[PDB]
Every structure is written in structure tokens, then in C-alpha cells.
Write a protein that binds this ligand. Structure first.
Ligand SMILES: Nc1nc2c(ncn2[C@@H]2O[C@H](COP(=O)(O)OP(=O)(O)O)[C@@H](O)[C@H]2O)c(=O)[nH]1
Ligand SMILES: Nc1nc2c(ncn2[C@@H]2O[C@H](COP(=O)(O)OP(=O)(O)O)[C@@H](O)[C@H]2O)c(=O)[nH]1
Lengths: 99, 429, 429
């Protein structure tokens, strides 16, 4: 065959931690662009911190609720947001309000 | 008042403007430094529309220059008339488009547009009464098709009343400078029919005939091809920068030339075009400038108007001339070509006459034609799209950027709705 | 009259002043010797506020310089404009702070403050009518945080009516120049909210962006970073040293900008800031100086004002300009940013216009902003404090200096009271 396996990208949102006035940049997350889960964090480094956030960079990725630490990329789901923190402590503000 | 903000995008859209701002500085008599060395006070009378007076009686262009790689912006600042720009306006990323529409619209577009719209918003507040925005890009590339159509969808959400016109370069039908240009053109016209007021479609293939058959140029480089496009762009707004007997602007064209909120794709036209030696075997009269604006070999879009019908015709004349002489010829060409115009629109020619000719010439003109003859141009893009899409080739370079096939289907269905509209009004009664 | 005594402390607070007194001597035209070489009599009209006329028509700065080691005071007297000071004012110990707040406040502070307050009391009796005291220190070190806040608690007990303002340097949030700087900043703000009238918080991280993004400096040393701080400090008191159309002083700012006896932490701002070559692509008008004072990339504290609300805004303009032009722009920026200002304070902009510009320029301005956006700055100091205090790390270096944990608990509880206040008035109605 030639019509291949639909190498699609997930359309997921990444709110950064603490910043209430931030919308979350939708990435083209797929298995073709990042061979491991560790390669995704390097893209999260440059395209989230500009001047005032994240002195430690990006370490931990949480759920929007958030009560579960994200493991591999297979634990991601299409069209749901995620809080991108850099510490064990989670800040509980209304991220998804006024997208 | 009535200031115009000029926006450039893509490798093509920058090299057009790099010649274009050389042309505008010639008409107002501006050195490459930025000072003034004119002769008459009419050059400084309406200078504010394309310029801002800086401190020290120096003028800067009100231009915004957008790219994704610095390979072209370095060429602009290195050449002549590169020192005239402001260094803040050169907005550029680092990744490069890679000749990809989805990278220009999703990946590198979203990481750049916020830095662009701050510069757009700064230039808008500097203007007293904003007339509108003009844009120079192309449809074949990934930058001017992706980043350019992203800016129009953001500007129209912030300015739902100002005029918005684009000098896009439609890809030529015979030769193809990009393998995936039916994919780039289809996903761009879907953005242009929703958020633009008028659009000046230019084909490259028509410019090679004019430089060869008419101007008799042996070696036409892009320094000569872009010079014809820049003369057309100045000729549209020449009544806004100079007093004339019968004045028009960018607003009066969108009322006259656009009878329906979708059918707003034009074709340009310039006259006179002599040769280097054959210029003396010719008289410069208004019927001589008339007959050159209507033949098919002077159009800048690769489509013969004889296959279709005109709907509206603009004709911006420059230089001093008799108004009786102009109005009789515009009546004459309508009676003899009574089958080539549409029936249910009487007096379908709009005329504007300025006073100041271009530099070096005595009189000139500018043809802006709307027609049903451009439906053949949208057949070929729609035909070459479905020829490639049915095998789903060159598709994983777009799906991997976060895009589904439903995006392609509705974009192709939008263009076939446009083809049926020009087909319907061609045979109205 | 209205003389000002300038006090310096810490390694940072001395190197700011060592550039600062070079700036003030430029405005009044003073050689490094101490004589006068000006051109106009306006420089000598109000010279007594920062100077004392010695015998022989020589002027000395009314400055007090405090340190715990002579490693920095030797650098001041060795450089240019080091001969201008008086050798009696160089008060310095021998032990050194060791980057420790408790050593600066208990051990070496108590063995030095009596020698300092004799020099303070001598300079106070020399003044005709004292205006107040300004202080230059920093919060990260041990000298300017310990010895500096000890002096404020002694001066306020001797002068409960004079104004007291500090140009403290708040530590930057991303990089950290001291491991224990959350302990030094928390134990200093507990002293600043009780005994100061207003405070100008400056972040280092904001100065690196302004030197790079705006001024386009490749190699910014501290000789260029402290020069921006010194231009801001002179711009606050420029109406007290020169006649103007609308005059203000240090007293009128503390009435306007301080609505509550605790909320007195500011953020500064300076304009215009050109580049070395991009200065010619810009006009020098009041709306051009207006729009640069309010964007987030010109603040000197690392906090975006868009996260919070302004309460009061000062704007000290220099150079000749139309008062109608100033007052319309101050109205204009309040109407369009109607969500970014507080509601229950109408006309929350205070304007003062001097007459004499800075040296070399034609006009300038100075932004003094109070906001609720600095609560994020006090979140981070309070968060990094409790992150270190819950493990009781770096604590025995403070307990061994005679201090209990109850001192830390009430100091941290004072800061969380301050965080709730800026949170409360942000959502008032
Ligand atoms: N008329 C004209 N077309 C040009 C010029 N430079 C490039 N082009 C056209 O631009 C298209 C390529 O797009 P490009 O500007 O490179 O976009 P990008 O690669 O995404 O930045 C092709 O159709 C070229 O023929 C020029 O100077 N003049
Ligand atoms: N802006 C600025 N900050 C300085 C300068 N010198 C030191 N600092 C800051 O001062 C702090 C260190 O405090 P310091 O003055 O040495 O106090 P001490 O060690 O107790 O005498 C750090 O935050 C440094 O970044 C300077 O010239 N300019």
C-alpha cells in the first residue's frame, strides 16, 4: 500500500505555570517529531520562557486538574490542555478561563 | 491624512518592495540618505501617506518587513535605498519557512505574529486618519502564503473597516517554480476570499512576454521585471498623492470595481511601453494609450479577456490631457467590443485623471480590469490540486504540522464555489 | 534651602553613587577638582542642595559613605571624581559584612553606627532647612541590607517628619547573585515597610534587557548600567534644582503617589532611550516620549504592569514643551487603558514639567509608577524564603549572631500581610 498510517499531530495546549495571563501555544505533537518524551521538553524550553517565568526551565508536566504527572507521550490525549511547571508544587488557578 | 501602511512578506514580496520604495522616492525626490532634494512643493504636500517626518527633516518609509530567515533581509539592508528604512521594522525569525504553507501558518507563524502585530499597532497609532493597508507577497512560497494570510486574518479582526488589498503573485501555468504550489495556492485563496477587499493577481509568465515582445529586452533580470510591478502599484495611488482634475483613491475603487463581496480578483495593466529605439516611431496621444491597455498582450495575468467578459474597468490616467478625448475613447471601446463586456452593467468604465506624469514621461495610464476570464486561472489551480490530492501525495509534510484532510476538502470546495460564480455571471441576462 | 543629604551603603550602593555624583557635577558644570566652570547662573542658583561652599569657592558633595571593609572605598577615592569628596565622610570598619544580614545589623552594625550618626548629625546642622534624606543600597548584600536598614531605624527615631526614600536594588528573579538573598530580602523589607516614606525598587534583570533590546549595547558593563540608574535619580529631583512651569519636589510625590502608609514601593522608568545609530530614525515629540514610558519593556522592575493595575503615576518632564500637548496624552493613555488603571481613583496621573533638559538632549522624561504588579515580586521572595526555611537551611549562620526563629516568623508574616493588601485593592469596587 501507499496511503500510509496517517502520521497526524496531536493538537494539545500547554499553559505555563503561574502566569494567569497566558493562553497556551498549541503544538504539533506527534511521534515523528520527537522520538522520545525527553526530546519534547527541549522544545518546551525555548518556546515558553521569554523574560519572566521558569528559572529551572521545564521539568514536570501536569494535567489541567491537576492530579496526575504525565509520563510518556502516549499518555497525552488530543485536544486537552496541560500545565507545564518546573517544580513538585502545583499552583491551582483558573487556566482554561477565557481561551 | 489618509495614510497607508505597507507590509511585505516572503522572498518575492520583499524584492518587489525593495524596487518599489526606490520608485516612490524618485517621485517625491528622496535621496538614499532620507533627506529631501526635490524642486517643487507638490512633492512635500502629501508626503505623509508613505512617510513619517523624523527629527532633522528626514523621512522614513512606513514599511513593515516580515520574513522567517534573515537571508533576504540582509540583502535589502545591503543594497541601495536600504539605509532609508527603520531598523526596528525588520522582523525576522530563524527557522525559515522551508516552502511550506503549514509551517508558515501554524508553526513559525504563531511564534512570530505577536512580534509583528506590535509593530503594526505602533504604526497604526502614528497615523492621523488611517486609509488602509497594502500587502506585497506571493502564493507560491511558504512565507508569503502562510505568514501573509495569517496577518490578514489578524488585521481584519482588529480593523473591520479599513481597506485591505494585496499584490499577490499567482503562479504561472506553464512553468512551475514549486512542486507543491497547487497546495499553497489553494490554501491561500481560501484565506483571501474571506478577508480581503480587492486583490491584484500578477502572473510571472505574462511579464516575460512583455519584456520580450513589447519592450524588446534581451536579458530581463528581476530588476527589470519588478520595475513594471512597481510602476503599477504607484499608479493606483497616484491620485491620492497628487491633485488631479478627477480624483479617486483606494476606497473609490473598491466601490466601483467590486460588485459582489467575493468577486474581487483583478488583473493590472500599464501603458505606454515602448522599446529603446522604437519609441520615436510612435505618437503619444490618448487613443494611442487607449488601444494598448485593452489588447491581450499587455495584460499582466496569463488569461485572454476574449474568453470571458469584463465586469468593471478602472483607468487611472496621469499627465495633462483633454477630458473630452478620454471620455470619447472610453465610449468608443465599449461600443465596438459590445460582446466582450457584460450586459446588465451599463457604463462599466471608471475614469480617474491625475496631473503629474511619471518621471521622464509626458503621460501614462494604468489599467485595472475585473473579468470573468480569470476563472480559467482558478480552473488550473483547482485541476492541479485534485490531480495531486487524489493520490494523497506531498501530504505528510502538511499532516505532520497538525492538519487534517478536512482542511483540504473545504478549501477545495470553496474554490469550486468561486468557479461556479464567474460561470454564472458570464451568462446572465 | 531644602537641602538633601545623600547616604550610601554597601558595595552596590557606593558604585551607584560614584557614577551618580559624576552625573550631578555634569549638570552643574563641576570639575573633578571642585571648582566651577559653568556657563549660566542657573547652575549656581540652587547649588546648595547637593553642595556646601567651602573656602576658596570650592564645592563638596553632601555625601556620607558607609562600608564595613575598605575594599570599595579605596576604589572610589582612586577613580575620577574621587578627590571631590570630603575625607571625613569615608566611614568604614575592618571586619567586613561577609554577606550576612545579622552581622550587618547586630555585630558590625552596632560597632559602627555611632561613628556614622555623628557625621549624619554634623551634616544636618549644616543645612539651613532640611528637605530629607535619600539612601542608595541593595537588598542582596549584607552591608546595604543590614547596616542600611539599621540607619533608617535610627534616623526615623531622630527625624520623624523629614522624607526618607531609598533606591534599593531588589534581586532579580531568574539569576541569583547570592545563595541567601531570600533571607536578606525578607529581613530587610520588614524594616522598609515600617520606616520609609517611598522606595524605588530596581531589578538588575530589567537593566540587561534595556541595554540589549533597546540601546543595542554589545558589552554593557556596570559603568553603563549604573548610568541609567543615575539618570533616574537626578530626574526625580530635577524640579527642586531648577525653575519650571509646574514644579514638584520630594514632598509632593509622597502625597500624590502614596495613598496608604504601607503601599509605597514604586517602579522607575526613563525616556527617551535611542541607539547609537537608530537615534536619527525617530522624532522627539511628547507623544513619542509618552508611548515609551508605558510599555513593559522600559520598566526597571521585572514585573509586567499588565498583570496588575496602576494606582498612581508620576511623570517628570524636562525641557521646553507645550502643556496642552502633555495633558492631552496623559488623558489619552488613561482612556484607552481603562482596564489597566484602578477605578476608585480618578485622574491618577501627576505631572511635573521642568525647564532645563539633560546634558546633550533636547527633552526627556521620568516615569515613577505605583502598581499592584509588584505583588508578584513579593510572592517570589516569600516563596523562596519558605522553600529554604522549612528545611531550616542556612540558619545557623544567623542564629549564632544572636537571633531566634521568632524573628523570621514575624518577618515572613509581615510580608504575607503585604501580599494580601495589593491583592485586596486590585479587585476593589
Ligand atoms: N516577479 C517576481 N517573482 C519572484 C521574485 N522572487 C521570487 N519570486 C517568486 O516567488 C515565488 C517563490 O516564493 P518565495 O518568495 O521564495 O517565498 P518563501 O520561499 O516562502 O519565502 C516563486 O513563484 C518565484 O517566481 C522576484 O523578484 N520577482
Ligand atoms: N546594578 C548594580 N548592582 C550591583 C553593582 N555592584 C553590585 N551590585 C549588586 O549588589 C548585590 C551584592 O551586594 P553588595 O553591594 O556587595 O553588598 P555587601 O556585599 O554586603 O557589601 C548583588 O545583587 C549585585 O548584583 C553595580 O555596580 N550595579
Amino acid at each position: 500500500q501507499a496511503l500510509s498510517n496517517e502520521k497526524k499531530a496531536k493538537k494539545v495546549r500547554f499553559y505555563r505555570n503561574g502566569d494567569r495571563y497566558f493562553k497556551g501555544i498549541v503544538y504539533a505533537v506527534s511521534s515523528d517529531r520527537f522520538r522520545s518524551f525527553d526530546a519534547l521538553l527541549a522544545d518546551l524550553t525555548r518556546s515558553l520562557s521569554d523574560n519572566i517565568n521558569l528559572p529551572q526551565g521545564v521539568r514536570y508536566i501536569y494535567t489541567i486538574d491537576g492530579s496526575r504527572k504525565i509520563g510518556s507521550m502516549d499518555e497525552l490525549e488530543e485536544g486537552e490542555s496541560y500545565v507545564c511547571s518546573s517544580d513538585n508544587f502545583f499552583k491551582k488557578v483558573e487556566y482554561t478561563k477565557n481561551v | 491624512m489618509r495614510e497607508i501602511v505597507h507590509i511585505q512578506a516572503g522572498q518575492c514580496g520583499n524584492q518587489i518592495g525593495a524596487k518599489f520604495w526606490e520608485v516612490i522616492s524618485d517621485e517625491h525626490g528622496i535621496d538614499p540618505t532620507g533627506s529631501y532634494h526635490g524642486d517643487s512643493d507638490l512633492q512635500l504636500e502629501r508626503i505623509n501617506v508613505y512617510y513619517n517626518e523624523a527629527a532633522g527633516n528626514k523621512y522614513v518609509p512606513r514599511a513593515i518587513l516580515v520574513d522567517l530567515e534573515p537571508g533576504t533581509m540582509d540583502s535589502v539592508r545591503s543594497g541601495p535605498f536600504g539605509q532609508i528604512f527603520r531598523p526596528d521594522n525588520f522582523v525576522f525569525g530563524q527557522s525559515g519557512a522551508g516552502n511550506n504553507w503549514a509551517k508558515g501558518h501554524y508553526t513559525e507563524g504563531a511564534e512570530l505574529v505577536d512580534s509583528v502585530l506590535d509593530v503594526v499597532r505602533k504604526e497604526s497609532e502614528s497615523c492621523d486618519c488611517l486609509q488602509g493597508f497594502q500587502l506585497t507577497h506571493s502564493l507560491g512560497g511558504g512565507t508569503g502564503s502562510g505568514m501573509g494570510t495569517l496577518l490578514i486574518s489578524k488585521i481584519r479582526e482588529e480593523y473591520p473597516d479599513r481597506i485591505m488589498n494585496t499584490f499577490s503573485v499567482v503562479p504561472s501555468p506553464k512553468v512551475s517554480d514549486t512542486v507543491v504550489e497547487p497546495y499553497n495556492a489553494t490554501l491561500s485563496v481560501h484565506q483571501l476570499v474571506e478577508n480581503t477587499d480587492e486583490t491584484y493577481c500578477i502572473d510571472n509568465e505574462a511579464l516575460y512576454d512583455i519584456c520580450f515582445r513589447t519592450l524588446k529586452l534581451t536579458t530581463p533580470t528581476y530588476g527589470d521585471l519588478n520595475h513594471l510591478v512597481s510602476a503599477t502599484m504607484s499608479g493606483v495611488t497616484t491620485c491620492l498623492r497628487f491633485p488631479g482634475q478627477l480624483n479617486a483613491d483606494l476606497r473609490k475603487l473598491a466601490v466601483n470595481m467590486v460588485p459582489f463581496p467575493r468577486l474581487h480578483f483583478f488583473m493590472p495593466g500599464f501603458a505606454p511601453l515602448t522599446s529603446r529605439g522604437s519609441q520615436q516611431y510612435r505618437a503619444l496621444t490618448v487613443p494611442e494609450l487607449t488601444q494598448q491597455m485593452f489588447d491581450a498582450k499587455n495584460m499582466m495575468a496569463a488569461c485572454d479577456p476574449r474568453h470571458g467578459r469584463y465586469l468593471t474597468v478602472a483607468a487611472v490616467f496621469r499627465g495633462r490631457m483633454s477630458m473630452k478625448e478620454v471620455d470619447e475613447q472610453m465610449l468608443n471601446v465599449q461600443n465596438k467590443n459590445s460582446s466582450y463586456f457584460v450586459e446588465w452593467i451599463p457604463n462599466n468604465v471608471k475614469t480617474a485623471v491625475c496631473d503629474i506624469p511619471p518621471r521622464g514621461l509626458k503621460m501614462s495610464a494604468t489599467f485595472i480590469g475585473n473579468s470573468t476570464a480569470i476563472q480559467e486561472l482558478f480552473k488550473r489551480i483547482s485541476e492541479q490540486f485534485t490531480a495531486m490530492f487524489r493520490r494523497k501525495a506531498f501530504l505528510h509534510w502538511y499532516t505532520g504540522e497538525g492538519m487534517d484532510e478536512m482542511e483540504f476538502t473545504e478549501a477545495e470546495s470553496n474554490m469550486n464555489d468561486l468557479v461556479s460564480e464567474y460561470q454564472q455571471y458570464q451568462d446572465a441576462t
